[PDB]
Design an enzyme around this catalytic site. Structure first.
Site, PDB file in Angstrom:
ATOM      1  N   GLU A  12       0.863  -1.177   0.000  1.00 19.07           N
ATOM      2  CA  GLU A  12       0.000   0.000   0.000  1.00 19.07           C
ATOM      3  C   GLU A  12       0.902   1.229   0.000  1.00 19.07           C
ATOM      4  OE1 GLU A  12      -3.399  -0.540   0.089  1.00 19.07           O
ATOM      5  OE2 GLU A  12      -4.008   1.568   0.001  1.00 19.07           O
ATOM      6  N   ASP A  13       1.292   1.670  -1.195  1.00 20.16           N
ATOM      7  CA  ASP A  13       2.191   2.809  -1.378  1.00 20.16           C
ATOM      8  C   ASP A  13       3.492   2.611  -0.598  1.00 20.16           C
ATOM      9  OD1 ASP A  13       0.578   4.175  -3.187  1.00 20.16           O
ATOM     10  OD2 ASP A  13      -0.526   5.210  -1.597  1.00 20.16           O
ATOM     11  N   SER A  14       4.175   1.518  -0.927  1.00 23.11           N
ATOM     12  CA  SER A  14       5.511   1.246  -0.421  1.00 23.11           C
ATOM     13  C   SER A  14       6.292   0.555  -1.525  1.00 23.11           C
ATOM     14  CB  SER A  14       5.481   0.395   0.854  1.00 23.11           C
ATOM     15  OG  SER A  14       4.942  -0.888   0.601  1.00 23.11           O
ATOM     16  N   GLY A  51       6.101   6.861  -1.486  1.00 22.02           N
ATOM     17  CA  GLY A  51       5.986   5.647  -0.705  1.00 22.02           C
ATOM     18  C   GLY A  51       7.240   5.349   0.088  1.00 22.02           C
ATOM     19  N   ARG A  60      -4.700   5.986  -9.248  1.00 25.29           N
ATOM     20  CA  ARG A  60      -4.021   7.271  -9.346  1.00 25.29           C
ATOM     21  C   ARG A  60      -3.889   7.721 -10.794  1.00 25.29           C
ATOM     22  NH1 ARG A  60      -0.890   5.549  -4.763  1.00 25.29           N
ATOM     23  NH2 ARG A  60      -2.262   5.911  -2.967  1.00 25.29           N
TER      24      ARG A  60
END
Ligand code: MG
Ligand code: ZN
Ligand code: ZN
Lengths: 34, 46, 196, 67, 49, 192, 258, 115, 49, 51, 147, 240
Positions: free
Chosen positions: C155-157, K13, K45
RNA sequence: AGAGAGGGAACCCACU
């Protein structure tokens, strides 16, 4: 004459001339100068 | 006992004293740079 | 074409941007005057005869990429993105570590973030040449792969390469300055630098 | 700043290629021709020189503080 | 003497106006710096329009 | 644990090959856009000659606005449907949408076929200048491209006017997001 | 119930790389040999940097980092060196380390390049690899200098990436995916591998359910710290040593249980 | 700060057993082999070799966590055949084939360098 | 700041070419704080005489 | 203690060869601020050798 | 891990984990990724520009020239980029068969790979990590300090 | 003024009495981890070596706590405070004489928290009760809060620089209270819409959608590799 | 082996 299709490389020449003449901070320097 | 400072723009070195105004002898430059320490440094090359 | 010929040979003819302004070729148009101007986007499309749109153009835009700011100009293909993404990148681009100034070794800045091996982008714009982003860059070209994996880029990593990092990949250096002076006062409290 | 010793992905020794890369550039080669003249087949090794900015030459203009 | 007024760098009344990049590097000032900011108590200030 | 460890064997990605449709689909999209654009133009030429009749309940300008928005929304929906019939069951956009993990059909339609009409305050792009949206358009231009409709997709990229109108829409979204927070928090605090 | 007999066929052998084919072995064995190429092969790399003096524009830890990644000729010494932490010496000795000394001051108006050549060893065999130019460590303006003593020690790729002898280990099995492990959506768009043997009319090989991964193709390109073939020899010896020590601990545990 | 030292991948400590045998209780003739300070570069080959036995009913291995350096190899063999025997035979088979491979690689080097 | 209205924050049509449409602080200062476009230049003004 | 603020060198163990400064010290162990890493680690006094 | 990285498209991130080179996947050649990003960060996105930057980065790193990414060009679309990439022995759309780093079995899907330009943000995790236990206490009221 | 000192959102009533600064709390960035349970959070060592739990000395744990006191502080397994029967605190970070380091039944030992301790994990906009839940401590090396994937949905935390707050219940009674009330297994189904809040997050969801398709077949080795990760597997390989 | 910490207020930029 005119620039029929070498305009793509001709516009960035004038952009470079503008940013070599003026620069990015002409607003601040010119305002304080005046 | 005196501490050796590097005289900024002059790049020369001179002694200093406690309660001594910070001035160079060459041109009286106000900014001194302390010399690198004399104790050993060891760096893991990682 | 003669303007371009005299403009390529700068530092020889001393033909500057101001000479082109004096030549009556370009001129500065403000916001009031934009309400009363017919503005051509690009000349290769809006001066050739077609099923005519207006055929009454007064000015022509130099290049559409000059509508963007300084931080929106470092985005590759910003028109292919979504606008909130462009805004968020404009927020992040003023935050990327890099060589912020050339004389950083002299400056006693607080919170100086500089990078070991900054690189120019392989995918660049023409406008980075004028922000001088290729001379003081911020970031490294990295071989990314867009892959689902063990489950740490969830998740956004992002999953990073330990060996690459050990080879100086994004290894930055953080400087922090501390200032202190003593105060000669009315003899009641007197600061002085000494080993306590 | 200065050229990395190794390619980040491979570990290929690229730190010894920079000065020869500049020599091949000033000898009127293309950048693609200069890269594989230096012998860089993988593009991850090619981006190490193709996208490097030799910033240390700017840092050497200033007089050294210690002397 | 009326008083001292601050000067933003790279002006026409700053010391390093029109200096070559070699001269700037002699002054420990980089040519990359665009100026346009004041130095007040050692802090660099920008007048937001 | 076990599904991630199977995903190691399987592997899942997304790429630029998942955002490109075959040339027949592109021809269908362009034909639909051209047909809808010509329909909007002929509706405009009906409106100029007072041959457009007002819908009972609103003005003539809005019978016109309702017609234009209806045509453009129909174009957007038809192009989205014709785009999402050509994933070939291996497209990773479809892999994420069908599972419902991330995204929807609208994202596929906007990436592949067409971004669609850009809106500010629920209507089209207003005339910020004197009776025109941007200085590149002629005055009193109620067409699709002049009023904010974007016929390009994120794969092809936007023209500068479409880019600016898309930025307007994104700015409206960001304003909504930034202003909602304090009011919602205060409502929660009062309720508790 | 036993191990199949593998075989080796070397296609080329250069001072940079070695290209070979290993047939009649399992996939896990082949992948492990590749992973032992990357990690478990020990070489000699600088790990202990003492900066006596430094005036360069690059700071001390940046210079120590750049000294770490320099490859060293360890073709025969690494088998003789003990690991530094395993030696009974007074924390450093010529049996678990190699001494390097750098002493450069720039006394000229030209920018003086402190390269890998200025690293002076006391062991004539362990020297930096650099026909090719030397590895640039740091440039020097007039008046700047750096003096340092650097001890290099034995280590392998798991510890740090500076002990990695391989530039690149290309590894692939079934270049026409008759096993169909990877499933192309449109195999026509896909370029053929270097080891493909299908005619240009055909895209990929027909599927066989009874097949298994075999005939693994390796391309092991060294960085110069080792010859490309002694990387493979050391890797096989290291993997055998790891399994032997695992067996010894296994025997101890079994004897403890009984 | 909280960075584990680089020698945590392969170096044991006092009070750490390299291999730990725990007899499974769910099914007969099954054992969990906890190998400390190793990774897939051992367990993968051990699992592949244990799959070649006709008397191993289950051969698997997993890392509990990639940040903690340990693997567990679960072996279930046919009754009358101990899983420990299968493990100590897999290790010997791997050593045998690796030594044979090394010798053949030496012969290949001698062929290539001498024409 | 902290105003519930939107008209001073929105991307008006006359922001074309003079001010960047994308760059803005996305906190509680959306649209209020802006970044100037590249070729945009603020007229320093002269005398009307 | 006496060892406090004394540059020590780990002469035994996994951290052998590291130069550090003793922050805390006991009869048995002592905490060493390593000059290389951004970490302070504790080692036995028998493994330390002063400069 | 915890250090905050970002692309040039708002694709930020933190670092989830750091694998060594032998654990990282690899192509038919020896090229491993430096960063592995989430495929799910794309579709909602809608940063197709990130994918196009990756494709143009492959084309640029193979061709030996710094690629051009001006927004409104019409001389560079994705099809021309794909046709330029196809000449250098790659797939049309930048997909490349990655081999698994742990098992060695080649991944069934074809992973999109290539060079992008990533930025390390000022935000580490060492600057943000802090714990507390009965430390300093305010004087106005006997409550713990701030920050 | 006094009225200005009381009337604000920074005054005494809201600012100091309602929401106040608390000891025994940590705040750091979260990064994902799919290899630990949904009620486990992976806290760093330097956080666990600074937040203490007051464990009462009883004859069951007197030897273990004695060993932890012998380790002292900064020997992770160690403690920093040892509290007498009369409430007298004795430091372990300043290394007292070994004479007053004994333990009899009744002493308190503020020991560094280990695996299995219960903590409260929350994000900032606590709009509902699943934004603040109890996790079990797992000690992992790096300096982030490694928490699971499915707990993202109730927390609305997308790991892109998010940092969470971790409170430590000091008493044993409140520890049991958190274990019996605010555990994330006990906060799966929400009362607001009688539905679960955890769910299955993006990547696991896509991989399981592709996994459970009809045309998915697994070799024996892959089956054993997958079954190695089942915690609730009774050791019987199913019929193919 | 001698053992605790304090400032405080104001205003900017970001972070999720
Ligand atoms: Mg977040
Ligand atoms: Zn002087
Ligand atoms: Zn020794």
């Amino acid at each position: 004459e005119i620039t029929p299709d070498l305009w793509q490389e001709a516009c960035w020449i004038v952009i470079s001339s503008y940013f070599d003449e003026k620069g990015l901070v002409r607003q601040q320097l010119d305002s304080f100068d005046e | 006992q005196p501490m050796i400072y590097i005289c900024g723009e002059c790049h020369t070195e001179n002694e200093i004293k406690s309660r001594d105004p910070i001035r160079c002898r060459e041109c009286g430059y106000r900014i001194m740079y302390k010399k690198r320490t004399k104790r050993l440094v060891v760096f893991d090359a990682r | 074409k003669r303007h371009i010929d005299q403009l390529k040979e700068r530092e020889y003819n001393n033909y500057s941007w101001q000479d082109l302004v004096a030549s009556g070729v370009v001129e500065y148009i403000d916001t009031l005057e934009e309400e009363t101007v017919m503005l051509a986007m690009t000349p290769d499309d809006l001066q050739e005869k077609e099923v005519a749109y207006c055929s009454t153009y007064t000015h022509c835009e130099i290049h559409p990429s000059m509508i963007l700011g300084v931080c929106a100009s470092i985005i590759p293909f910003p028109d292919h993105n979504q606008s909130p993404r462009n805004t968020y990148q404009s927020a992040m681009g003023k935050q990327a570590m890099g060589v912020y100034i050339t004389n950083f070794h002299v400056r006693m800045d607080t919170l100086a973030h500089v990078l070991y091996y900054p690189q120019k982008p392989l995918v660049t714009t023409r406008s980075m040449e004028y922000l001088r982003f290729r001379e003081l860059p911020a970031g490294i070209n990295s071989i990314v792969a867009i892959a689902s994996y063990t489950g740490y880029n969830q998740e956004d990593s992002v999953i990073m390469n330990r060996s690459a990092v050990d080879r100086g990949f994004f290894r930055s250096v953080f400087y922090r300055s501390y200032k202190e002076q003593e105060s000669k006062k009315g003899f009641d409290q007197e600061e002085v630098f000494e080993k306590p | 700043m200065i050229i990395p010793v190794r390619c980040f992905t491979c570990g290929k020794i690229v730190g010894n290629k920079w000065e020869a890369y500049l020599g091949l550039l000033q000898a009127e080669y293309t950048e693609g021709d200069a890269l594989d003249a230096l012998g860089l087949k993988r593009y991850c090794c090619r981006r190490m020189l193709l996208a490097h900015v030799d910033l240390i030459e700017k840092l050497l203009n200033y007089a050294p503080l210690e002397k | 003497f009326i008083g001292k007024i601050p000067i933003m760098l790279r002006s026409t009344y700053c010391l390093l106006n029109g200096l070559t990049d070699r001269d700037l590097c002699e002054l420990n000032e980089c040519p990359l710096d665009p100026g346009g900011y004041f130095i007040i108590n050692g802090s660099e200030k920008v007048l937001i329009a | 644990t076990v599904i991630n460890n199977w995903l190691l064997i399987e592997g899942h990605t997304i790429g630029i090959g998942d955002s490109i449709a075959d040339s027949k689909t592109y021809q269908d999209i362009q034909n639909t856009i051209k047909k809808a654009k010509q329909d909007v133009i002929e509706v405009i030429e009906k409106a100029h000659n007072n041959e457009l009749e007002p819908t009972p309940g609103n003005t003539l300008r809005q019978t016109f606005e309702n017609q234009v928005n209806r045509i453009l929304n129909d174009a957007r929906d038809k192009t989205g449907s014709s785009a999402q019939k050509s994933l070939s069951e291996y497209n990773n956009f479809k892999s994420m949408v069908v599972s419902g993990a991330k995204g929807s059909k609208i994202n596929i339609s906007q990436v592949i076929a067409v971004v669609g009409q850009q809106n500010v305050e629920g209507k089209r792009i207003p005339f910020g200048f004197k009776h025109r949206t941007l200085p590149h358009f002629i005055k009193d231009d109620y067409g699709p491209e002049s009023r904010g409709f974007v016929e390009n997709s994120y794969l092809a990229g936007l023209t500068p006017t479409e880019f600016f109108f898309h930025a307007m829409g994104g700015r409206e979204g960001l304003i909504d997001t930034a202003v909602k927070t304090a009011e919602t928090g205060y409502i929660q605090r009062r309720l508790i | 119930p036993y191990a199949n007999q593998p075989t080796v066929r070397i296609t080329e052998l250069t001072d940079e790389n070695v290209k070979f084919i290993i047939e009649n072995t399992d996939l896990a064995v082949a992948n492990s040999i590749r992973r032992v190429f990357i990690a478990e092969v020990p070489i000699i790399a600088i790990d202990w940097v003492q900066i006596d003096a430094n005036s360069s524009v690059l700071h001390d830890e940046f210079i120590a980092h750049r000294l770490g990644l320099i490859p060293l000729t360890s073709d025969d010494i690494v088998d003789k060196l003990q690991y530094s932490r395993d030696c009974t010496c007074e924390e450093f000795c010529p049996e678990c380390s190699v001494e390097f000394t750098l002493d450069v001051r720039c006394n000229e108006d030209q920018t003086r390049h402190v390269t890998s050549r200025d690293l002076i060893s006391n062991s004539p065999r362990v020297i930096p690899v650099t026909e090719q130019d030397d590895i640039l460590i740091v440039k020097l303006r007039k008046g700047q200098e750096l003096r340092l003593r650097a001890y290099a020690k034995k280590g392998f790729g798991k510890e740090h990436a500076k002990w990695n002898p391989t530039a690149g280990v290309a590894f692939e099995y079934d270049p026409d995916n008759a096993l169909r492990h990877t499933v192309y959506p449109k195999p026509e768009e896909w370029p053929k591998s270097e080891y493909s043997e299908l005619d240009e009319d055909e895209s990929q090989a027909p599927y066989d359910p009874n097949g298994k991964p075999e005939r693994f193709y390796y391309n092991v390109e060294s960085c110069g710290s080792l010859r490309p073939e002694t990387i493979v020899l050391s890797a096989l010896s290291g993997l055998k040593k790891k399994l032997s020590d695992l067996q010894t601990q296994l025997s101890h545990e079994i004897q403890s249980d009984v | 700060m909280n960075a584990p030292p680089a020698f945590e991948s392969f170096l044991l400590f006092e009070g750490e057993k390299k291999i730990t045998i725990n007899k499974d209780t769910k099914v007969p003739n099954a054992c969990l082999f906890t190998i400390n300070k190793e990774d897939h570069t051992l367990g993968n080959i051990i699992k592949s070799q244990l799959l070649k036995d006709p008397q191993v009913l289950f051969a698997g291995y997993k890392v509990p966590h990639p940040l903690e350096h340990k693997i567990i190899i679960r072996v279930q063999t046919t009754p009358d055949y101990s899983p420990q025997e299968a493990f100590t035979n897999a290790i010997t088979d791997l050593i045998s084939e690796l030594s044979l491979l090394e010798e053949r690689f030496r012969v290949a080097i001698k062929d290539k360098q001498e024409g | 700041r902290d105003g519930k209205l939107a008209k001073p924050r929105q991307l008006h049509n006359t922001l074309w070419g003079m001010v960047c449409p994308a760059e803005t602080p996305e906190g509680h200062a959306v649209g209020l704080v802006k970044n100037l476009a590249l070729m945009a230049y603020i007229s320093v003004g002269s005398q009307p005489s | 203690n006496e060892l406090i603020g004394q540059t020590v060198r780990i002469s035994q163990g996994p951290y052998k060869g590291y130069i550090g400064v003793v922050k805390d010290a006991t009869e048995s162990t002592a905490r060493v601020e390593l000059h290389s890493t951004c970490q302070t680690i504790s080692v036995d006094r028998q493994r330390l050798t002063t400069v | 891990i915890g250090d905050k990285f970002a692309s040039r498209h708002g694709q930020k991130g933190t670092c989830g984990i750091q694998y060594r080179q032998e654990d990282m996947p690899f192509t038919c050649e020896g090229i491993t990724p430096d960063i592995i990003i989430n495929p799910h960060a794309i579709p909602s996105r809608m940063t197709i520009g990130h994918l196009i930057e990756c494709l143009q980065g492959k084309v640029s790193a193979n061709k030996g020239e710094i690629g051009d990414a001006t927004p409104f060009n019409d001389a560079v679309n994705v099809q021309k980029i794909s046709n330029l990439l196809s000449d250098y022995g790659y797939h049309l759309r930048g997909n490349e068969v990655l081999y698994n780093g742990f098992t060695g079995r080649k991944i069934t899907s074809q992973i999109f790979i290539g060079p992008t330009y990533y930025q390390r943000l000022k935000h580490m995790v060492d600057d943000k990590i802090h714990s507390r236990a009965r430390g300093p206490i305010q004087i106005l009221n006997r409550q713990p300090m701030e920050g | 003024s006094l009225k200005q000192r009381l009337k604000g959102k920074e005054g005494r009533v809201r600012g100091n009495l309602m929401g106040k600064r608390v000891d025994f709390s940590a705040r750091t960035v979260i990064t994902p981890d799919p290899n630990l349970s949904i009620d486990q959070v992976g806290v760093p060592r330097s956080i666990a070596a600074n937040m203490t739990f007051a464990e009462i000395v009883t004859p069951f744990n007197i030897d273990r706590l004695q060993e932890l006191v012998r380790r002292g502080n900064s020997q992770y397994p160690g403690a920093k405070y040892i509290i007498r029967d009369n409430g007298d605190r004795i430091d372990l970070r300043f290394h007292p004489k070994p004479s007053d380091l004994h333990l009899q039944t009744g002493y308190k030992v503020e020991r560094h928290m280990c695996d299995g301790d219960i903590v409260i994990f929350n994000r900032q906009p606590t709009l509902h009760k699943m934004s603040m839940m109890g996790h079990r401590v797992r000690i992992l090396p790096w300096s982030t809060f490694r928490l699971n994937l499915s707990v993202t949905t109730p927390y609305n935390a997308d790991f892109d620089g998010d940092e969470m707050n971790l409170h430590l219940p000091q008493s044993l009674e409140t520890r049991a209270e958190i274990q019996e009330l605010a555990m994330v297994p006990r906060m799966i189904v929400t009362p607001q819409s009688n539905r679960p809040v955890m769910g299955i997050v993006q990547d696991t969801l896509t991989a399981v959608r592709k996994f459970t398709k009809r045309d998915v077949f697994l070799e024996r080795g892959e089956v054993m590799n997958l079954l190695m990760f089942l915690s609730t597997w009774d050791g019987k390989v199913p019929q193919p």
